[PDB]
Amino acid sequence: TRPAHAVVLGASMAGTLAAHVLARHVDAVTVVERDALPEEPQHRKGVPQARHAHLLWSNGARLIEEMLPGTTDRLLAAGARRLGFPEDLVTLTGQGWQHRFPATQFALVASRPLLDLTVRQQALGADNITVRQRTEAVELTGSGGGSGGRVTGVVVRDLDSGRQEQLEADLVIDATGRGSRLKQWLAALGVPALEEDVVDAGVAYATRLFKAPPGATTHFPAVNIAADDRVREPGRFGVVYPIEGGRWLATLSCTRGAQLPTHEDEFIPFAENLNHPILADLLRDAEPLTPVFGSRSGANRRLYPERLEQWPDGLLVIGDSLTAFNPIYGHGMSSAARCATTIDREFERSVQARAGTRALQKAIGAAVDDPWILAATKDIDYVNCRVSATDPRLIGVDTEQRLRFAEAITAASIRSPKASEIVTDVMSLNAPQAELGSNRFLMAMRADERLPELTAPPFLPEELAVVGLDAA
Amino acid sequence: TRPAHAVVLGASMAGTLAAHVLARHVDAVTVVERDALPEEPQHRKGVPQARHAHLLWSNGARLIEEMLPGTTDRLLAAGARRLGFPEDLVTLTGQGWQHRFPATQFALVASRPLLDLTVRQQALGADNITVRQRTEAVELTGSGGGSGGRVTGVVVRDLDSGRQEQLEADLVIDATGRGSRLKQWLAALGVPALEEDVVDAGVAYATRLFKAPPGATTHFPAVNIAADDRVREPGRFGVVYPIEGGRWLATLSCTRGAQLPTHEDEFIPFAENLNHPILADLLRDAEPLTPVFGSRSGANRRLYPERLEQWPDGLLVIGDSLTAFNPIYGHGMSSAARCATTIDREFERSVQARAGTRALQKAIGAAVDDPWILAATKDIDYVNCRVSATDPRLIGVDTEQRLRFAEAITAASIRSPKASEIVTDVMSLNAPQAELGSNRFLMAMRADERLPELTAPPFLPEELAVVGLDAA
Ligand SMILES: Cc1cc2nc3c(=O)[nH]c(=O)nc-3n(C[C@H](O)[C@H](O)[C@H](O)COP(=O)(O)OP(=O)(O)OC[C@H]3O[C@@H](n4cnc5c(N)ncnc54)[C@H](O)[C@@H]3O)c2cc1C
Ligand SMILES: Cc1cc2nc3c(=O)[nH]c(=O)nc-3n(C[C@H](O)[C@H](O)[C@H](O)COP(=O)(O)OP(=O)(O)OC[C@H]3O[C@@H](n4cnc5c(N)ncnc54)[C@H](O)[C@@H]3O)c2cc1C
Ligand SMILES: CC(=O)OC/C=C(\C)CC[C@@H]1O[C@@]1(C)CC[C@H]1OC1(C)C
Ligand SMILES: [Cl-]
């Protein structure tokens, strides 16, 4: 019969959205969150990635807006900014500067804790959602492997008390992020291991918060230095996004074989050694507000529970636990919104053999293919890249043809409007990566006008005035 | 690599939309249509159903509008009407008259040949679609059976000539309607027979065109008379929709075990023996413009090429040939729009070893599940219904439970606004039928007000003035 009680494990983006949606179809929804959840925008041990820059692409923004009307207006009231792509950015690519064509896509930019709090507020207010903060999921109960295994509940442990308790449920949602022990829990229940694709370029991040020159959060574009020669050299990148409170979030990145700034005095010299020193120039005399924060969670890994015949009934895995991506492309939250979107849209059809949770998990798997195959294609050809994947779209490919086509796509997007719009659709997770091989894109790539090469970064004079620069 | 030439077999609703969509992804697209296609709105031997009432539910209309912008305005320019449900209809159900709540869904109503021509106009004009009229596809070429056979092309026969040239293609789409020889073509090439669910209530139709009282096509609602019972007696129904040209399209229907008006003189007496004589009264002094047209195509059929592992590469089946429904629910065209919509949205992702066509056919099959189980559930329990199906949602269900819930839904839909909106979402193919078992709907069914039972059909006095009637 219908599920009556659902336990969502984890209360970050994936868990929160899935819990809000399940509450519409399930009588009772418990959320099990290890951390205490602040009622003020504040960092916390469970989401350490929140220290680094976070783009909410249009896909995620529009999907969240549909689940939770008013969330965008609430975020912008709080000082968030809607960056239009490519209009509101100064971007250096491997092929040159991006012409700031009129915005055809957008991302919402803000400190991640502000976005998390604003979503929790809109989503977890429901009467039939009980969130148990300071509570840790320890393992899953039930049988597994063979014939017809199912998950019956979850053993949770109060952290402030230390007591343990078995929490029974008809449905269990693992949303415990990239560091999920699902594999451990599954081995405990006697479930055979899952298929796992991995494309790991060894990306790491180093981030500092800065106080921005007055007005730069609204009248100065974001600046991104994303040039790369993947097969010869490890990548080195840098970004400066505006966030709320007149602040600049500056995030530097590299791939395996390169070295990030460990100390504060090494931050600027890394931005100086990029293909253009604009970032070092912008941050030279900005006031630093934090030390350097680091992250090493940059690998593209994807589990395939939809392929496991022994997948236990009543168990779903969403978010970073199901599949996590190279954050340079900023799709983690959008694909979290996708998983909750999919649960909302296939739940009723799936509960009418409990082939309904394996149907849910199958629809969920399809929903996250777009960010997986985008990040895996871009990263697969880096020098030193660790690759362990069965995806035929990656393994049996003529690599030099792949990079020649990669350079063509970038060369078209930076200097031709029709080719730029399609790329932003893919970059904003609103169109599949395969659209860039479509005849439509091939004809835009060939027939559209190509503006001249920008010799200097395309800043408006006003914009250089806001930060006290001119010339290049 | 990508397919280069696609042959769409059939140029009705399914074929035309698929041809327009394939043309966006395929360099060359030929459509093979048996009939000659008129440039003026006219009936034709290939679409004999066009004589009978045709509702374009909101689902189909919005899908067509997105693929072919401007089609809605063109239809209404031609005199079509957008019926708002339930506001613009006078409907008798098994549980009483439907309260004309403000419209929460809509259908486009017009003569089917008018809809056919204006969609062909918007769709087949493309540079890379050549339509060869008066040409019949007779059988398929290629390999087949065992491992992974493929279809190489189609043997076509020029009709005005007697000629018989083979037309090769990378992809072939069977859109030849309910009376397609697909099964013959597949058996000849050695592919095993496909799974087929059928729930056939023996539905037949009898239709007459009438000239409507001046203004009634704009200021008088559609009138729908739907019989109550199913388990004791065959159903007897009638509807009168306004169509373009100040005309009334009147279509009467019954299920197996009843007798339809076969000739002209028993039309009125059949609408006279319905549970309310409003239909016979409305056409008593109207001018009949046609003789009575008949149809016996009322069976719910669903093929499962997504289930056949021996399904030939490069072959797709869409439209009525893939799955056909009891037209009382008016979803055939909406499910055609879905099939081309699904092709358009997963073509690029799937042809990227033709493991892509079997993915397309799986995506298409999912798109047509909603009308299938929306047409099979209502019909499954009719007297005399012949059923041969593997669908667990029909075979393993408590008959009295299905019936008890059916009347509860209708009793709620006719007298409660919140319950009415959800039902119209489902009936207009905008929500899966499983939504009517949702917690959302169950609490709408229980918490929303129930207006008093309507004693008389709910015509406004103004409306009866337009047609010269009064009383009940
Ligand atoms: C450096 C970096 C930059 C990123 N930038 C972007 C970006 O620009 N845009 C974007 O869209 N995405 C970005 N991402 C990805 C994004 O942060 C995640 O995809 C997003 O947070 C969704 O993760 P999640 O909800 O699945 O789990 P997480 O966000 O990782 O959270 C897991 C939650 O589960 C809880 N939990 C864990 N274990 C247990 C347990 N045993 N019991 C109870 N609770 C538990 C944790 O406390 C936490 O609250 C970035 C990621 C990184 C690392
Ligand atoms: C009585 C009745 C009422 C209906 N009412 C509604 C309604 O209210 N709403 C709704 O949405 N749907 C309704 N339908 C269904 C709707 O008519 C169809 O679903 C719709 O026309 C889509 O069909 P199709 O394009 O797949 O094939 P069809 O419309 O049946 O057309 C098949 C085409 O293929 C061609 N063809 C066939 N064989 C060959 C061959 N060997 N070689 C070449 N060409 C060939 C034919 O000439 C024709 O052009 C109704 C159907 C019937 C029978
Ligand atoms: C980096 C490379 O060659 O990999 C292939 C590139 C692909 C598949 C598309 C990515 C776009 O080329 C990028 C990186 C430029 C877009 C940015 O200008 C923005 C701000 C819209
Ligand atoms: Cl991190």
PDB file of N, CA and C in Angstrom, chain A residues 149-185:
ATOM      1  N   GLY A 149      14.520  -8.247  -0.843  1.00  0.00           N
ATOM      2  CA  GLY A 149      14.916  -7.460   0.320  1.00  0.00           C
ATOM      3  C   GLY A 149      14.310  -6.069   0.359  1.00  0.00           C
ATOM      4  N   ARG A 150      14.235  -5.509   1.570  1.00  0.00           N
ATOM      5  CA  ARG A 150      13.646  -4.184   1.765  1.00  0.00           C
ATOM      6  C   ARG A 150      14.276  -3.510   2.980  1.00  0.00           C
ATOM      7  N   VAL A 151      14.287  -2.178   2.965  1.00  0.00           N
ATOM      8  CA  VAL A 151      14.751  -1.388   4.099  1.00  0.00           C
ATOM      9  C   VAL A 151      13.550  -1.026   4.966  1.00  0.00           C
ATOM     10  N   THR A 152      13.637  -1.344   6.258  1.00  0.00           N
ATOM     11  CA  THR A 152      12.533  -1.174   7.193  1.00  0.00           C
ATOM     12  C   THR A 152      12.642   0.095   8.026  1.00  0.00           C
ATOM     13  N   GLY A 153      13.819   0.708   8.090  1.00  0.00           N
ATOM     14  CA  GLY A 153      14.024   1.832   8.979  1.00  0.00           C
ATOM     15  C   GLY A 153      15.501   2.151   9.114  1.00  0.00           C
ATOM     16  N   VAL A 154      15.798   3.044  10.056  1.00  0.00           N
ATOM     17  CA  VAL A 154      17.152   3.553  10.248  1.00  0.00           C
ATOM     18  C   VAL A 154      17.446   3.639  11.741  1.00  0.00           C
ATOM     19  N   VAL A 155      18.645   3.216  12.126  1.00  0.00           N
ATOM     20  CA  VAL A 155      19.127   3.374  13.494  1.00  0.00           C
ATOM     21  C   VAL A 155      19.755   4.758  13.617  1.00  0.00           C
ATOM     22  N   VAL A 156      19.169   5.602  14.461  1.00  0.00           N
ATOM     23  CA  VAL A 156      19.651   6.961  14.670  1.00  0.00           C
ATOM     24  C   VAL A 156      20.224   7.073  16.075  1.00  0.00           C
ATOM     25  N   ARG A 157      21.165   8.002  16.242  1.00  0.00           N
ATOM     26  CA  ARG A 157      21.822   8.234  17.525  1.00  0.00           C
ATOM     27  C   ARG A 157      21.766   9.717  17.865  1.00  0.00           C
ATOM     28  N   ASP A 158      21.015  10.059  18.911  1.00  0.00           N
ATOM     29  CA  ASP A 158      21.060  11.408  19.462  1.00  0.00           C
ATOM     30  C   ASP A 158      22.494  11.761  19.838  1.00  0.00           C
ATOM     31  N   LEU A 159      22.949  12.938  19.408  1.00  0.00           N
ATOM     32  CA  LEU A 159      24.325  13.325  19.699  1.00  0.00           C
ATOM     33  C   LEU A 159      24.452  13.946  21.086  1.00  0.00           C
ATOM     34  N   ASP A 160      23.488  14.779  21.487  1.00  0.00           N
ATOM     35  CA  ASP A 160      23.577  15.408  22.802  1.00  0.00           C
ATOM     36  C   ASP A 160      23.358  14.412  23.930  1.00  0.00           C
ATOM     37  N   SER A 161      22.679  13.304  23.659  1.00  0.00           N
ATOM     38  CA  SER A 161      22.426  12.306  24.687  1.00  0.00           C
ATOM     39  C   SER A 161      23.396  11.150  24.524  1.00  0.00           C
ATOM     40  N   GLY A 162      23.542  10.680  23.294  1.00  0.00           N
ATOM     41  CA  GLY A 162      24.264   9.472  22.996  1.00  0.00           C
ATOM     42  C   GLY A 162      23.411   8.230  22.930  1.00  0.00           C
ATOM     43  N   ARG A 163      22.123   8.327  23.245  1.00  0.00           N
ATOM     44  CA  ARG A 163      21.292   7.142  23.154  1.00  0.00           C
ATOM     45  C   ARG A 163      21.006   6.835  21.690  1.00  0.00           C
ATOM     46  N   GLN A 164      20.713   5.568  21.420  1.00  0.00           N
ATOM     47  CA  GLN A 164      20.455   5.102  20.071  1.00  0.00           C
ATOM     48  C   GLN A 164      19.015   4.630  20.028  1.00  0.00           C
ATOM     49  N   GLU A 165      18.471   4.543  18.824  1.00  0.00           N
ATOM     50  CA  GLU A 165      17.076   4.174  18.697  1.00  0.00           C
ATOM     51  C   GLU A 165      16.833   3.723  17.271  1.00  0.00           C
ATOM     52  N   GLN A 166      15.936   2.759  17.115  1.00  0.00           N
ATOM     53  CA  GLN A 166      15.572   2.269  15.796  1.00  0.00           C
ATOM     54  C   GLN A 166      14.349   3.046  15.327  1.00  0.00           C
ATOM     55  N   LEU A 167      14.447   3.634  14.141  1.00  0.00           N
ATOM     56  CA  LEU A 167      13.426   4.522  13.596  1.00  0.00           C
ATOM     57  C   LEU A 167      12.787   3.811  12.411  1.00  0.00           C
ATOM     58  N   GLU A 168      11.549   3.356  12.580  1.00  0.00           N
ATOM     59  CA  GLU A 168      10.902   2.593  11.525  1.00  0.00           C
ATOM     60  C   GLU A 168      10.296   3.523  10.484  1.00  0.00           C
ATOM     61  N   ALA A 169      10.259   3.044   9.243  1.00  0.00           N
ATOM     62  CA  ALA A 169       9.838   3.881   8.132  1.00  0.00           C
ATOM     63  C   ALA A 169       9.471   3.001   6.949  1.00  0.00           C
ATOM     64  N   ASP A 170       8.559   3.508   6.124  1.00  0.00           N
ATOM     65  CA  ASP A 170       8.207   2.850   4.876  1.00  0.00           C
ATOM     66  C   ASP A 170       9.134   3.238   3.736  1.00  0.00           C
ATOM     67  N   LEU A 171       9.785   4.393   3.839  1.00  0.00           N
ATOM     68  CA  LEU A 171      10.684   4.901   2.817  1.00  0.00           C
ATOM     69  C   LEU A 171      11.833   5.618   3.508  1.00  0.00           C
ATOM     70  N   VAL A 172      13.046   5.424   2.999  1.00  0.00           N
ATOM     71  CA  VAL A 172      14.241   6.045   3.558  1.00  0.00           C
ATOM     72  C   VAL A 172      14.999   6.730   2.431  1.00  0.00           C
ATOM     73  N   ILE A 173      15.370   7.990   2.649  1.00  0.00           N
ATOM     74  CA  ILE A 173      16.029   8.809   1.639  1.00  0.00           C
ATOM     75  C   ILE A 173      17.410   9.165   2.168  1.00  0.00           C
ATOM     76  N   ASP A 174      18.448   8.629   1.531  1.00  0.00           N
ATOM     77  CA  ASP A 174      19.821   8.995   1.861  1.00  0.00           C
ATOM     78  C   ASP A 174      20.173  10.279   1.123  1.00  0.00           C
ATOM     79  N   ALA A 175      20.323  11.368   1.867  1.00  0.00           N
ATOM     80  CA  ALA A 175      20.776  12.643   1.330  1.00  0.00           C
ATOM     81  C   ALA A 175      21.934  13.174   2.157  1.00  0.00           C
ATOM     82  N   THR A 176      22.848  12.283   2.544  1.00  0.00           N
ATOM     83  CA  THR A 176      23.941  12.620   3.443  1.00  0.00           C
ATOM     84  C   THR A 176      25.197  13.064   2.703  1.00  0.00           C
ATOM     85  N   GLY A 177      25.078  13.397   1.422  1.00  0.00           N
ATOM     86  CA  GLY A 177      26.142  14.066   0.708  1.00  0.00           C
ATOM     87  C   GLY A 177      27.226  13.147   0.174  1.00  0.00           C
ATOM     88  N   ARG A 178      28.306  13.796  -0.274  1.00  0.00           N
ATOM     89  CA  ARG A 178      29.420  13.094  -0.903  1.00  0.00           C
ATOM     90  C   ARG A 178      30.081  12.104   0.046  1.00  0.00           C
ATOM     91  N   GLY A 179      30.072  12.393   1.346  1.00  0.00           N
ATOM     92  CA  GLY A 179      30.677  11.512   2.322  1.00  0.00           C
ATOM     93  C   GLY A 179      29.652  10.602   2.960  1.00  0.00           C
ATOM     94  N   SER A 180      28.868   9.927   2.126  1.00  0.00           N
ATOM     95  CA  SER A 180      27.809   9.053   2.601  1.00  0.00           C
ATOM     96  C   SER A 180      28.331   7.636   2.789  1.00  0.00           C
ATOM     97  N   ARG A 181      27.872   6.991   3.857  1.00  0.00           N
ATOM     98  CA  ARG A 181      28.247   5.622   4.171  1.00  0.00           C
ATOM     99  C   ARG A 181      27.262   4.606   3.604  1.00  0.00           C
ATOM    100  N   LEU A 182      26.465   5.006   2.607  1.00  0.00           N
ATOM    101  CA  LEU A 182      25.512   4.102   1.962  1.00  0.00           C
ATOM    102  C   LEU A 182      26.138   2.753   1.629  1.00  0.00           C
ATOM    103  N   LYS A 183      27.334   2.767   1.029  1.00  0.00           N
ATOM    104  CA  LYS A 183      28.006   1.515   0.692  1.00  0.00           C
ATOM    105  C   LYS A 183      28.210   0.649   1.926  1.00  0.00           C
ATOM    106  N   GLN A 184      28.636   1.260   3.032  1.00  0.00           N
ATOM    107  CA  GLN A 184      28.763   0.533   4.290  1.00  0.00           C
ATOM    108  C   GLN A 184      27.410  -0.002   4.749  1.00  0.00           C
ATOM    109  N   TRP A 185      26.389   0.861   4.769  1.00  0.00           N
ATOM    110  CA  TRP A 185      25.049   0.425   5.155  1.00  0.00           C
ATOM    111  C   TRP A 185      24.556  -0.709   4.264  1.00  0.00           C
TER     112      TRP A 185
END
